[PDB]
Design a protein around this ligand. Structure first.
Ligand SMILES: [Ca+2]
Ligand SMILES: [Ca+2]
Ligand SMILES: [Mn+2]
Ligand SMILES: [Mn+2]
Ligand SMILES: [Mn+2]
Ligand SMILES: [Mn+2]
Ligand SMILES: [Mn+2]
Ligand SMILES: [Mn+2]
Lengths: 253, 253, 253, 253, 253, 253
């Protein structure tokens, strides 16, 4: 077998990819989302009740479908990053990255030694299909994609330094964390926050990195797409399930 | 502790109850549905990948919320009915009921001996809260509700006979199975099917039983409510999740 | 490897075995029970929320301990009996047995062809340790033990006929089901019920079969042991957990 | 989306398909088997500790790979057959089929009304991808494959009658059950059994049906392939895992 | 919907709350505990085999009952604290707190930016009921309760400094860890240990903080309640299950 | 009950123990491996999709068999080590140990206070059988075995210093991580790597510590056994399952 090509990673340079957040934390729900036709699905190990085993079940569900899987670990934890890569996650989204030093550690965490620090266990890994991908250890690094989140004042304070890290493929802006950090918790739509988001997207792209964001606000999402944002998540499964059931009930009260 | 009052069962005589089908087969998804405010939630053990243990998880999730749980077993199987009653399901929906003889057996399956054949194991049952409901074996039968589905030609051929069974609280019409049985598979909206459905609702209510139905078609659901249908399910969680995610993606393609 | 000797089955003829009911339906809780020193543990697939997979987890937990595992299926279902034997349950307790014809079917359901109807799949079975027990298909039948429950009027009406079935190792009396069948639901302690239980134990033993029963009433349990009852379960894990936690709280209200 | 084409079903008429039995009862183990390149994988719900939910996880794992999934239910149970079809199993292997009447019931169990009795719930079914296969109810039946097992004296007594059932796509011979039925339990390699197997294969093919078998004996498997047997399973995951670990240990004792 | 009021947190100032430790690590066992009537239940993620997903199942079980849930994470890990708050735990018990610096970090870990560092993901959180609690991000912090454990010499060496941390609602003494730290492992009952515990309770309360402790010794527990200790756990589910089953067997040996 | 004797730990001084890696991450697969007769089984929490709960299931499966369980946590994380010891793992294998300071911290992480920092919760621990091992807190430390991995340049740079740590029972060489660290990723068989491995084994044994290694290469494994290596793992369950299934298919293509 050849290593699974990371099309998400290639398309960061060629198109704008539309994403759906997957926080229902279940292989069955992940498969439902996989049928819709999103460019990428974000399996959330930070804000949904997921662990390595439940994320593996969702990777296995999604794998039959063209949607690219991206996984968010709970934090930039080197050993957890090792575990998620070995179950076969090819694109990681690291929350709350706040320095070039931390971003560089995340780059190494995703790459085999001697250049990186990713632990080696290809005989045991779905990532290598248990060495049925016979050249995995040679071809793995080329298909790994690292995305880091800037979503704090310290992240913004180190933005130019993070953008100079070779191996950071994309910077994703987190409006919920960033608006709370700025003292506008629950209110990212305020002009003070949105002007910082727009300037941040412009700086990310000017440095030759892919920019990303999540917004369930259709008008904001379309504005970010108009600015050239490369990876835009446009909703969340938990939110769509709740809202669709509420809207239906309201027709009957 | 007092036995949990079956408000669904009482309200069969006092109001029209709006329902949501729960086929996502998971305690987490069942809780999301429980927050919306439906009168009843149908945990589907016939057409969703559920078993006694996954249904128990969903009963435990929903139990903190006012929505009444109804469970559909895969068939009118007496020992499975015993298992579902003991994990604490107070309202059952039996598919494909086709005779007064079968409806009477379902009545007995839901009631303790000597009047019925429900197996006795109150020390072990969530239903009795492990005997923390001190008088459960005396008070249980009063709070159990039996619903049967008419959804075949043979069911329609035995409708008057099923409607004379004491202990059948409600008859639910299944438009998907019934339209297929009538040779209009995938097309319940046809006049030939709808005339049979409307006449069937009228007969159910004339015999003093509650009538029920599921339709994801808003106009049909409102027509059934106008006709006095007592328990109307108006959508399905799997369908709403898929439709909401597809409608969103179509705004961005 | 040698087939696991069924010591429960041997001891039916040599001693009185003390049992604990296991309805917590989990491998971890079963292991806690397995540490205490009961002669037998009853994994309840009738009145606790168990299935083949949860029962397997409990067999694996208990297997490291001398306590003998007995499994109760939800009903006398031939294919389910096949599944339980293959995961390695060596003693079955069949509820609600009501005729010599049904008891004979249960005997055949536990024995390989050509003398019985137990389905053959030794390559896949924990029971054979995946054929690591090299002569399993020759040695299996000798270590299987069948227990049937008499706990209805129809069972009592067929008691002498059930007691003449070769291959029925034991008859277990279910006081909860029997007292409900007799119109004393929740009140097995009534003299009318107890006189029937005592006469039944005497007839079981007169016919050279092992007698069994469950009672959480210490005085009744000791009376049954004084009458020579071979397998007596003396409590239930769910009941002991609830009572122990309630008695403790009552010291502090 | 178009309905998933059942290539296993087509290839019954065009080639000989090599199979692997999947009894490790786990989505992770099923995915390992899916990487090897077998024409078909048999997810065993009869002799491995599987249920609807664990079979669904294995279907989801395998679905990313070319291997065709075949599922064996514990028995020819109409409601269980309904459940397995709705989770998306397109080929079923029914054990212990013993009459043309039973085979005909299995045909109906796999087909929608009005011609069959498969329950209709396409909104809830992975089989329809929750109606994302928009014409599922029209196109489903064409991709369902029914295989029945002949593996008892009564099955052999009704072989010609079973072979005249329209809708039976294949007859699979079970050597373990059949050798035990014939009084050669554990010894299917005896000439008396093998002559009956060879005559049975010849009769199945003469009637224009696909013949199948499992044998872990390479010489027997190759003989069955030389006789034109259309679907031949050549090993079992549990057996290969045990044997590979034992052979390795024996090099070191 | 209104944010769930943290009654445990209010009652720290108005009454003495009786607790039960929940280490059976399962939603079903947690529900049994929830029926008894304890003021609080401690879901142990430090000393019972729990993770975010098993803790979530137990929160869902308990939620239908008045008992207040308190969760103990394995350590004072900021990202794990984030995960536990989002699944909706409103009271945390942090083990092995040893400095005012660590206690201050734990305060911030429980509070939203800009005043704290709790990660923001209300669209995905059971805690906000997936934003069905419309003002969650404004009302969340007020209902969060932080308890820290003093149970080492270094904790005792920093007690006065920990007691001056605003946002520490309570200090819980761990007698097992503390007696081991003091060189009396397995012997907390020694006067040397007890005099330190009593002095510590008095200092906690003198500083206007709630004091807590676990003791399964009824006499010690009642002494702690007479000293005014606000939150006293009086037993452990695993210990009560084992002891209850052993005491019963001893009546029969 | 007496504490389970750690025979693995004793045999480090009296024989050479043959091991199998268990990465199938499931209680059912762990039991299959347990039947073969390996001296030790390595439940891999670093390179297989395991967590505390899935490792517990595997410890419970294996516990009925003489094979000694060794657990590898994802990293030298003190609170995770606490969790693994309490579910009853008596031998740990810590990856990527790089200093005497880190090895000393791992020694303390495995021993109760006051000498170590292992958290005390014996009422809740499978390790104490919930205190059914009456003197566990006095007898525990004697049966715990600590193994550390040297598998980086920094580990080799600190080898003499790690070998002088009292409480390190064994040093295990990781050829996959070490060959990658040395710039021969996927090529441990190179003379440059093998000379370092052989010299490292000689130094480990000269310092009076047990030496260990994993090699799926039969010749290398036998060379390591000839050199006196005390604990040699000779294969991996995932690799054997894949290889056995591929070798079989190649006989039929
Ligand atoms: Ca199940
Ligand atoms: Ca987990
Ligand atoms: Mn964020
Ligand atoms: Mn229907
Ligand atoms: Mn009974
Ligand atoms: Mn067979
Ligand atoms: Mn403690
Ligand atoms: Mn390594």
């Amino acid at each position: 077998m050849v290593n699974t090509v990371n099309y998400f990673k290639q398309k960061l340079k060629t198109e704008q990819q539309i994403g759906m957040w997957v926080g229902l934390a279940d292989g069955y729900c992940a498969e439902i989302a996989a049928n819709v036709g999103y460019d990428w699905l974000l399996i959330d190990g930070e804000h949904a009740p997921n662990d390595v085993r439940s994320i593996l079940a969702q990777l296995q569900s999604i794998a039959a479908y063209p949607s690219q899987a991206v996984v968010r670990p709970v934090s930039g934890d080197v050993p957890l990053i090792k575990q998620l890569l070995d179950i076969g996650a090819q694109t990681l989204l690291i929350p709350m990255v706040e320095s070039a030093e931390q971003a560089e550690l995340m780059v190494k965490a995703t790459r085999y030694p001697p250049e990186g620090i990713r632990g080696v266990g290809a005989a045991l890994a779905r990532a290598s299909r248990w060495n049925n991908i016979s050249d995995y250890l040679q071809t793995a690094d080329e298909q790994i994609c690292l995305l880091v989140q800037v979503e704090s004042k310290k992240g913004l304070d180190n933005l130019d330094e993070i953008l100079n890290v070779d191996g950071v493929d994309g910077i994703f802006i987190g409006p919920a964390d960033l608006s709370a950090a700025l003292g506008y918790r629950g209110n990212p739509g305020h002009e003070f926050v949105q002007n910082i988001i727009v300037q941040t997207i412009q700086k990310i792209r000017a440095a030759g990195k892919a920019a990303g964001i999540l917004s369930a606000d259709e008008k904001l999402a379309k504005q970010y797409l108009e600015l050239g944002t490369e990876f835009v998540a446009v909703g969340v499964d938990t939110s769509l399930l709740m809202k669709s059931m509420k809207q239906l009930l309201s027709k009957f009260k």
